[PDB]
Amino acid sequence: FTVMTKMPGKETADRNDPYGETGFSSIKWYYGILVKRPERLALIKTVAPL
Amino acid sequence: SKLPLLTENGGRVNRVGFTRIAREGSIHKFGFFYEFTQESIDFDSDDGLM
């Protein structure tokens, strides 16, 4: 998880916001799976009582 | 009515500017002289006229 946090201060001071009273925090990651042998996975589909 | 005020969402709000002024002067040249002849200095009764 790549986390990037900018607290209010000179870090967020900008021509659009000279005073810099906004901040944010973000998080991102990569995912994907590879299936080698599909035969070994099993499944049984059914209904369930209330 | 002309005070500088802000809100929590600060932005392009209050701008100020500065000015400078320049001054000048000049220079001029002076002088005067006098001339004499040798007999005037040699034969005058006053020894020390120079």
Query: By three-state DSSP, how is residue B29 classified?
Result: coil
Å resolution of this model?
4.0
Residue B10, number of CB atoms within 10 A of its CB: 16
Phi, psi of A29 (to 5 degrees): -160, 165
Instruction: Confirm if A30 and A20 have CB atoms less than 8 A apart.
Output: no
Report the DSSP pairing between strands A2-6 and A24-28.
antiparallel
Which residues in chain A touch residue B14, judged by CB atoms under 8 angstroms apart? none
CA A19 to centroid of chain Cα atoms: 29
Instruction: Confirm if A16 and B11 have CB atoms less than 8 A apart.
Output: yes
B36, containing H or E segment: none
As a dihedral over the C-alpha atoms of residue A35, residue A36, residue A37, residue A40, rounded to 10 degrees, the angle is: -60
Instruction: Confirm if A1 and A30 have CB atoms less than 8 A apart.
Output: no
A6-45 in b/e form (b: 16+ CB < 10 A) is eeeeeeeeeeeeebbeeeeeeeeeeeeeeeeeeeeeeeee
Q: How far is A2 from chain B (nearest CA, A)?
A: 28
CA distance B41 to B48: 9
Instruction: Confirm if B43 and B49 have CB atoms less than 8 A apart.
Output: no
Residues forming a β-bridge with A26: A4
Inter-chain residue contact A21 with B12, CB threshold 8 Å: no
